[PDB]
Structure 1
Amino acid sequence: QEDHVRSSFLLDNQNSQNTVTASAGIAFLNIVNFKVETDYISQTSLTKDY
């Protein structure tokens, strides 16, 4: 009896996360006040199995 067992496994994972926060606030002597902020979060995950 002759048995040959060949097993090959491959796994790859790439995760990219980008977070951008931009805030601007101007406050005068109780006469003018403007505050703004913007947050952008992007996450991409890719998994490859074989």
Structure 2
Amino acid sequence: VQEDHVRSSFLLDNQNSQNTVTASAGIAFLNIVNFKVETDYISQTSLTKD
């Protein structure tokens, strides 16, 4: 009388988020013929769990 059990379990996760923020300027004809401002911002987050 022989027997056996197998019980595999496989649970995987992922949370791959992102951000991208940009600003701008460019007030330039009068009292200052030119000055320009722009910022950039990018953020990532990738978290896997198995």
Give the structure-1-normalised TM-score: 0.84
Seen in structure 2, the aligned counterparts of structure 1 residues 48 and 31 have a Cα distance that, compared at 3 Å, is closer
Aligned-residue RMSD, C-alpha = 1.8
TM-score, with length taken from structure 2:
0.84
Q: Which runs of 4+ in 1 moved over 2 A?
A: none
TM-superposition CA deviations, 1:24-45 (whole Å, max 9, x none): 1112159521111101000011
Give the paired residue count: 49
Q: Which residue of 1 aligns with 2:12?
A: 11
**Structure-2 residue corresponding to 1:47:** 48
Task: Provide the rounded CA distance (Å) in 2 between the counterparts of 1:6 and 1:27.
Answer: 69
Gaps of 5+ in 1: none
CA distance in 2, matches of 1:10, 1:16: 20
Percent of aligned pairs with the same amino acid: 100
